Amino acid sequence: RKTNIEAYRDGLKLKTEEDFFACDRQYVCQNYAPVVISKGKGARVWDINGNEYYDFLAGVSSLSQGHCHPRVIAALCRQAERLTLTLRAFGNDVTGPACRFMAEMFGYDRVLLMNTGAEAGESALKIARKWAYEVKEIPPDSAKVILCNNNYWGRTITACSSSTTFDCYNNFGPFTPGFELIDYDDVGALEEALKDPNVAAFFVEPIQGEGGVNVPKPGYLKRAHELCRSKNVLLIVDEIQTGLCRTGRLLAADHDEVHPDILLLGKSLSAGVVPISAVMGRADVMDVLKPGTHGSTFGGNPLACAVAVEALTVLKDEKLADRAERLGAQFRDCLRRELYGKVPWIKEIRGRGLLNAVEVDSDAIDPNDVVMKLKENGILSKPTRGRVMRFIPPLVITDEEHRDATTRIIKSFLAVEEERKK
Amino acid sequence: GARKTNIEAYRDGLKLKTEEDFFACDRQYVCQNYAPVPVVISKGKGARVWDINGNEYYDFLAGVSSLSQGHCHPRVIAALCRQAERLTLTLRAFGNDVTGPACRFMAEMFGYDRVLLMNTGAEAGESALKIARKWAYEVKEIPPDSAKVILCNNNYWGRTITACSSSTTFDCYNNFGPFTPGFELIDYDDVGALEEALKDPNVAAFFVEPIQGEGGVNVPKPGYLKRAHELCRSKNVLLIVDEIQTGLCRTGRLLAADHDEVHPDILLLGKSLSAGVVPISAVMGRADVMDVLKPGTHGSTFGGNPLACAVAVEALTVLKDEKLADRAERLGAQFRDCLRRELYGKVPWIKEIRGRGLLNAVEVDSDAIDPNDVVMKLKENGILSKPTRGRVMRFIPPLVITDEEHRDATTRIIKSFLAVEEERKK
Numbered sequence: 001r002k003t004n005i006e007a008y009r010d011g012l013k014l015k016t017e018e019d020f021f022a023c024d025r026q027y028v029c030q031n032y033a034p035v036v037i038s039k040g041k042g043a044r045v046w047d048i049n050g051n052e053y054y055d056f057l058a059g060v061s062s063l064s065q066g067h068c069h070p071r072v073i074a075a076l077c078r079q080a081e082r083l084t085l086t087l088r089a090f091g092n093d094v095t096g097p098a099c100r101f102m103a104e105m106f107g108y109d110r111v112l113l114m115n116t117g118a119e120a121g122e123s124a125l126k127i128a129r130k131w132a133y134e135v136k137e138i139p140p141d142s143a144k145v146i147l148c149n150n151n152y153w154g155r156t157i158t159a160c161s162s163s164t165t166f167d168c169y170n171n172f173g174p175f176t177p178g179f180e181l182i183d184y185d186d187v188g189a190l191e192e193a194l195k196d197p198n199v200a201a202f203f204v205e206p207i208q209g210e211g212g213v214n215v216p217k218p219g220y221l222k223r224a225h226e227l228c229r230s231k232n233v234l235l236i237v238d239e240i241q242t243g244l245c246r247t248g249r250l251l252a253a254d255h256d257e258v259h260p261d262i263l264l265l266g267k268s269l270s271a272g273v274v275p276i277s278a279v280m281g282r283a284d285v286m287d288v289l290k291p292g293t294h295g296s297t298f299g300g301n302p303l304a305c306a307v308a309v310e311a312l313t314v315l316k317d318e319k320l321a322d323r324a325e326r327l328g329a330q331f332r333d334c335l336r337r338e339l340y341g342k343v344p345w346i347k348e349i350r351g352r353g354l355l356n357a358v359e360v361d362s363d364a365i366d367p368n369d370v371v372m373k374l375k376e377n378g379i380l381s382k383p384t385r386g387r388v389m390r391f392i393p394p395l396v397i398t399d400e401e402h403r404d405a406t407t408r409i410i411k412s413f414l415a416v417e418e419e420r421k422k
Numbered sequence: 423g424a425r426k427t428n429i430e431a432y433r434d435g436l437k438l439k440t441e442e443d444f445f446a447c448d449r450q451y452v453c454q455n456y457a458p459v460p461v462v463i464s465k466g467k468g469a470r471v472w473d474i475n476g477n478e479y480y481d482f483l484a485g486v487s488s489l490s491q492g493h494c495h496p497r498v499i500a501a502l503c504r505q506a507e508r509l510t511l512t513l514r515a516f517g518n519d520v521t522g523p524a525c526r527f528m529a530e531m532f533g534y535d536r537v538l539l540m541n542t543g544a545e546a547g548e549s550a551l552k553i554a555r556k557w558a559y560e561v562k563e564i565p566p567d568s569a570k571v572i573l574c575n576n577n578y579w580g581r582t583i584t585a586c587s588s589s590t591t592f593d594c595y596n597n598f599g600p601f602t603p604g605f606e607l608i609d610y611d612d613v614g615a616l617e618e619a620l621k622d623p624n625v626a627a628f629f630v631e632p633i634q635g636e637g638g639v640n641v642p643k644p645g646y647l648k649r650a651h652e653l654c655r656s657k658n659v660l661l662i663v664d665e666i667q668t669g670l671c672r673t674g675r676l677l678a679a680d681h682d683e684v685h686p687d688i689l690l691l692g693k694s695l696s697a698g699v700v701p702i703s704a705v706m707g708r709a710d711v712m713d714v715l716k717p718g719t720h721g722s723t724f725g726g727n728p729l730a731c732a733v734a735v736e737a738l739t740v741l742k743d744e745k746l747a748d749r750a751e752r753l754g755a756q757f758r759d760c761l762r763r764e765l766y767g768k769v770p771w772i773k774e775i776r777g778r779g780l781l782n783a784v785e786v787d788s789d790a791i792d793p794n795d796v797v798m799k800l801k802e803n804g805i806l807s808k809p810t811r812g813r814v815m816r817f818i819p820p821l822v823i824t825d826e827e828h829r830d831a832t833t834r835i836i837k838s839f840l841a842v843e844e845e846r847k848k
């Protein structure tokens with residue numbers, strides 16, 4: 001049987017990429033800015049004309065397990081035929097066991113399941129505030145949260161209120177108060193911010209994602225945790241982009257040996273199949289959310305839970321932390337040896353595991369020529385902040401595939417440089 | 423071959439046998455932000471669910487109107503499995519062969535120029551608020567940071583900090599501040615109060631439900647929405663109409679706003695947009711409003727993902743193919759008529775039976791009866807629901823409920839209320 005979307009699309013006679021871009025332009029809210037993908041499998045996607053590419057954005061680390069992982073799809077399909085949604089107003093035979101699975105895997109007492117990263121962030125801030133008011137006993141409406149410049153956690157009004165990125169906040173106010181912004185990767189600024197006794201939490205990414213793959217100094221996060229703990233301030237660690245093996249370890253916080261007070265997960269939690277996010281913490285923090293104080297229609301639905309248990313298990317069974325660590329060190333090494341020196345407009349090669357970036361001098365080169373050239377050579381990515389090229393493949397990428405992609409990526413940077421010399 | 427999926431292997435290894443075993447698992451590992459009816463549902467199909475002990479029930483919450491098409495509608499599940507084999511996520515950073523055609527499908531079905539797909543109701547409300555504000559600053563040219571949005575007391579649109587900031591429900595806001603400013607709360611179903619609030623020129627929008635759901639199935643006087651729209655239009659204020667609960671045939675029309683012949687300036691949809699299969703929401707509006715969201719000013723990882731779009735197109739088509747608007751109008755009018763003729767005369771602690779379509783409620787007097795006795799008795803008679811605000815009993819079945827099931831269910835419901843009354847007389 002043809003699905004309704006397929007039958008409906010056939011009647012439109014969208015044959016070329018430009019037909020799809022025109023349909024897009026006419027009917028889709030125009031809040032995004034080259035290719036029309038119809039199929040994905042593992043590390044590979046295919047456009048509507050049958051051309052193959054490596055996906056080096058991977059849902060900005062939502063597709064760590066690869067596109068259309070057969071185990072994840074089987075778990076989806078099996079659960080979807082049985083039960084998808086009950087609400088948390090009724091019990092069911094999936095939510096409990098799934099939260100226990102997550103509790104045991106990440107080492108926490110309680111799991112709050114929500115749907116998106118932004119909801120996980122809001123839920124953590126809410127928990128941190130109510131905890132501050134109720135357990136830490138700080139004055140009513142006075143709770144503060146410390147975040148870092150160039151953070152990204154969502155697009156809610158409150159997320160906009162805690163952004164330093166002009167386009168994220170501009171003309172969406174007035175703003176939620178209670179945020180203090182400091183420099184990333186700066187313990188001094190954190191110590192200084194931590195003198196205010198009304199601070200409920202410090203909310204931080206172990207590597208800043210959308211900010212430009214800003215990898216902090218080794219130990220930064222341990223130091224930050226020590227400072228938070230000595231002031232009775234919760235360390236909220238956002239691993240929505242950096243967790244789940246992406247950096248070579250189950251949590252990017254494992255590098256600095258930090259167990260977050262509140263952990264956020266998302267994205268690859270579902271292998272990019274359905275939106276599910278998680279907030280985890282110890283009992284005396286998470287239990288501030290009493291009945292009726294927080295909710296979500298779809299949060300914890302049995303379909304997402306079944307998908308997430310399968311997705312998480314893929315990470316472990318395919319040993320994807322080891323694969324990210326190994327391949328990623330080889331990637332950065334090749335790019336350093338074959339590009340530093342030969343390509344003067346490369347500012348920095350940086351990353352951990354398979355979360356990598358090449359920042360370029362956008363005064364010396366058009367970054368978009370790198371993007372175009374990459375696509376020409378079978379590599380799809382999208383930079384952040386104009387000038388930071390991102391390289392974020394599915395972790396399941398094979399040794400042969402990764403060698404091949406690395407060659408095409410290097411060849412792309414070199415072809416842009418040769419064209420510049422003329 | 424034969425094999426377990428991991429959720430099954432793991433659950434099997436925990437050796438959970440009784441409902442108490444599952445209740446205890448939930449209490450230990452799941453954040454305790456709900457007060458659930460004590461049942462452990464295992465299978466859902468159409469209007470029915472079964473628990474782990476085998477007991478069968480009619481689902482009379484239906485995900486609070488997330489499952490209008492029934493549990494596990496075979497067409498929606500087939501569309502889900504088919505698209506999931508092919509492509510589930512690209513981001514809007516890349517094009518794909520589904521997202522644009524799905525937005526076009528919706529734009530044409532609802533009559534709007536532009537469609538924004540988000541994931542949850544809360545995200546749709548946040549996005550609409552962002553649109554109305556930026557539009558106010560850039561098109562209406564009101565002063566920087568001065569935009570106001572009018573909402574109604576007892577509204578419910580989400581649990582973000584900004585939603586908490588615009589709530590009048592104590593447990594939604596308490597100890598979650600400090601709050602997002604820029605909200606002006608008025609009584610629901612009060613034209614005079616809306617009129618006075620609209621005298622402030624910094625008002626960007628009026629954000630309103632055609633029936634308040636979580637607030638208690640509060641059905642306004644007829645014409646209330648039409649009148650709200652005329653007032654908003656005369657002051658160059660956007661009418662944002664939240665149909666996340668009331669939309670998609672639930673009230674006997676495609677949109678509840680259709681009763682008043684209102685076309686919202688911004689329309690919010692969600693919940694049954696996916697037939698309860700995956701979270702997807704939508705914000706729709708005319709080009710000169712929606713186009714304020716320029717590249718880089720708003721986004722979402724999973725918003726408009728191809729899996730969700732294929733499910734939503736299938737879910738929407740089910741509404742039309744099974745004529746669920748007509749089924750809701752008919753069955754709902756019979757339900758309310760039956761309940762009034764069988765319960766009002768006999769049951770003194772029912773204050774009111776109200777609703778539209780198959781969005782119905784029975785408000786009880788909780789100073790006279792423990793509402794939880796009604797919930798328990800319903801369950802014992804094969805009916806699952808959860809009240810809102812302590813004392814508003816909700817009857818919101820899947821619209822696919824058959825005539826025979828609906829009659830059977832209505833008998834069970836009437837018998838439940840009369841039995842609690844019989845205990846009260848004693």
Ligand SMILES: Cc1ncc(COP(=O)(O)O)c(C=O)c1O
Nearest residue numbers: 116117118153209240241722723
């Ligand atoms: C670190 C981090 N937090 C939060 C989010 C928000 O995710 P969502 O788009 O699922 O709301 C993202 C997505 O880009 C992210 O990378």
Ligand SMILES: Cc1ncc(COP(=O)(O)O)c(C=O)c1O
Nearest residue numbers: 296297542543544578579666667
């Ligand atoms: C009218 C209305 N708006 C918004 C929401 C928020 O939906 P979600 O729980 O999917 O965020 C709901 C659902 O509870 C609703 O009924």
Ligand SMILES: OC[C@H]1O[C@@H](O)[C@H](O)[C@@H](O)[C@@H]1O
Nearest residue numbers: 015016017018019020021022
């Ligand atoms: O020129 C018209 C545009 O829209 C489509 O109708 C055509 O197929 C494309 O070639 C073009 O981008």
Ligand SMILES: OC[C@H]1O[C@@H](O)[C@H](O)[C@@H](O)[C@@H]1O
Nearest residue numbers: 073074075077078079081503
């Ligand atoms: O046939 C429907 C589905 O049922 C599940 O039990 C299988 O493992 C899936 O792969 C299959 O697509």
Ligand SMILES: OC[C@H]1O[C@H](O)[C@H](O)[C@@H](O)[C@@H]1O
Nearest residue numbers: 824825826827828829830831
């Ligand atoms: O549809 C009405 C239903 O009501 C009865 O309780 C029967 O037990 C059930 O099998 C039947 O299908």
